Ligand binder design. Sequence first.
Ligand SMILES: [Cl-]
Ligand code: NI
Length: 94
Amino acid sequence: WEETKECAFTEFFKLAPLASNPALSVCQDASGWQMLPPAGYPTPEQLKLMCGTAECFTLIDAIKALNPNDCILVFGDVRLNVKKLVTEFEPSCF
Ligand SMILES: [Cl-]
Ligand code: NI
């Protein structure tokens, strides 16, 4: 995955549909992991919770549908590759 090349700020705007998707709130509240604003990659504790929450799978699929780029999204000190996150999520659960 891309670990150096940074996303243009416009990449953030791709995430807009998530705010009107109920799965976002359910997943974030259940796990303590935040996508908006982005906290980064889920911690193992957060991932455990996400992997047992149907809505987190729904959320991850909804992010995939936005076609996130393979680049580092920079939000203050938070740095993550959203495409990496969503592609690796399902296998990370087991
Ligand atoms: Cl900094
Ligand atoms: Ni890589």
